[PDB]
């Protein structure tokens, strides 16, 4: 019944500002200090400062104090976290925090926004099939492969045979590097299952509505 | 202000096991520390405040103890769920600063990395591009590296990189490193080779292909 509302992801451009909402419902929003948390990636936590709402009494870590502005709207029972100047180093996710005065601690946390700093345009990916070298199987498996260059923003949806193939498949997390994302896929299969049967791989990119089927073909 | 030093950062653990993770404070915090717990995915949760006190539902095996500089959080006999990582988090004064955290990890066997590279698709080539790609499979422990040759010389640029996290069927780790290339330089160059360096293979295991 305690919940902090927050946006799954934003995307926002270089040296633009970007205004991060939690919205707290469930109990009275004067009654408890807000936090806010930086995530980095495979990195760990960092507290970034906090709010009364009501009177907006603040604190703040000092790595933060232009970095951050920290707000509140009783009316909307929703605290508000403005990041200006963006860069790179602000990409993360971003958590609020509800403080409970008896547990003197972080009692209830919202989902978190993750903050995507980037000057890219919605983009579909290049979808590539990836065949074993034209060697030999005579090992007893065989591996192949699917490469997803190009696209923006995440997410991407990457299944094998429609989702019939699940077992023995690695599907990577995504990387940015020159403001577009690339992720591949790798599927292992008994060599008795391929060529001998169709194995595709099916890519999904919700945000430029595309979906893309890639039979990988003997070389 | 306050900084926190957590230990250890890592460890890997099985089932069954106990394990103590410790936090310490520059100065004296008088009990003012709480633990959080951290899924993959997941929003931080909290499991102890006010250094020994265990929050409303967390289970009976997790326990906070210590007072002064000196705090630890123990989990006796660790169950399945129990994987992730760990926070502890001060609130002696501002910054409510957190330790930097301990991830527990699946103990498993080791194994090899299985090595595959894969040239360039017909498709990609077509376009202008030429991304070369190696897979390095279900390996442990986690610790890895690739190298890439272009006719037998190391090429560091142009190498893009990802890992998976621990498999949720057989706890192994995975690598993907693609190289890319224009398809003039590849067009240019005869054999390609990735070369991966694990605990099971300090000399590499090495796959080519000839253009």
């Known amino acids: 019944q305690v919940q902090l509302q927050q946006p799954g992801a934003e995307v926002v451009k270089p040296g633009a500002s970007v205004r991060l909402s939690c919205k707290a419902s469930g109990y009275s929003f004067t009654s408890n200090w807000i936090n806010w948390v930086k995530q980095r990636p495979g990195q760990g936590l960092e507290w970034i400062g906090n709010?009364?709402?009501?009177?907006?009494?603040?604190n703040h870590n000092e790595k933060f104090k232009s970095k951050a502005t920290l707000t509140a709207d009783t009316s909307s029972s929703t605290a508000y976290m403005q990041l200006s100047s963006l860069t790179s180093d602000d990409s993360a996710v971003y958590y609020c925090?509800?403080?409970?005065?008896?547990?003197?601690?972080?009692?209830?946390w919202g989902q978190g926004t993750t903050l995507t700093v980037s000057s890219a345009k919605t983009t579909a990916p290049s979808v590539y099939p990836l065949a074993p070298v034209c060697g030999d199987t005579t090992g007893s498996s065989v591996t192949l492969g699917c490469l997803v260059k190009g696209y923006f923003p995440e997410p991407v949806t990457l299944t094998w045979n429609s989702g019939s193939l699940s077992s023995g498949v690695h599907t990577f997390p995504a990387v940015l590097q020159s403001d577009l994302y690339t992720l591949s896929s790798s599927v292992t299969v008994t060599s008795s299952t391929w060529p001998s049967e169709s194995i595709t791989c099916n890519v999904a990119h919700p945000a430029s509505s595309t979906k893309v089927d890639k039979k990988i073909e003997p070389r | 202000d306050v900084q926190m030093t957590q230990s250890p950062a890592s460890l890997s653990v099985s089932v069954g096991e106990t394990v103590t993770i410790t936090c310490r404070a520059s100065e004296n915090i008088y009990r003012n520390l709480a633990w959080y717990q951290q899924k993959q995915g997941k929003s931080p949760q909290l499991l102890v405040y006010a250094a020994t006190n265990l929050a409303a539902g967390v289970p009976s095996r997790f326990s906070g103890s210590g007072s002064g500089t000196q705090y630890s959080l123990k989990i006796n006999s660790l169950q399945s769920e129990d994987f992730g990582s760990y926070y502890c988090?001060?609130?002696?004064?501002?910054?409510?600063?957190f330790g930097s955290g301990t991830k527990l990890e699946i103990k498993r066997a080791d194994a090899a990395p299985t090595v595959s590279i894969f040239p360039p698709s017909s498709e990609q080539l077509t376009s202008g591009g030429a991304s070369v790609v190696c897979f390095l499979n279900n390996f442990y422990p986690k610790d890895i590296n690739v190298k890439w040759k272009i006719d037998g010389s190391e090429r560091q640029n142009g190498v893009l990189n990802s890992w998976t996290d621990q498999d949720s069927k057989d706890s192994t780790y995975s690598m993907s490193s693609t190289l890319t290339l224009t398809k003039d330089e590849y067009e240019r160059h005869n054999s390609y080779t990735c070369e991966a360096t694990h605990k099971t293979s300090t000399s590499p295991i090495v796959k080519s292909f000839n253009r």
């Open positions: 988090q001060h609130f002696w004064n501002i910054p409510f600063t």
């Open positions: 709010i009364s709402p009501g009177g907006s009494n603040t």
């Open positions: 925090a509800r403080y409970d005065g008896d547990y003197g601690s972080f009692d209830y």
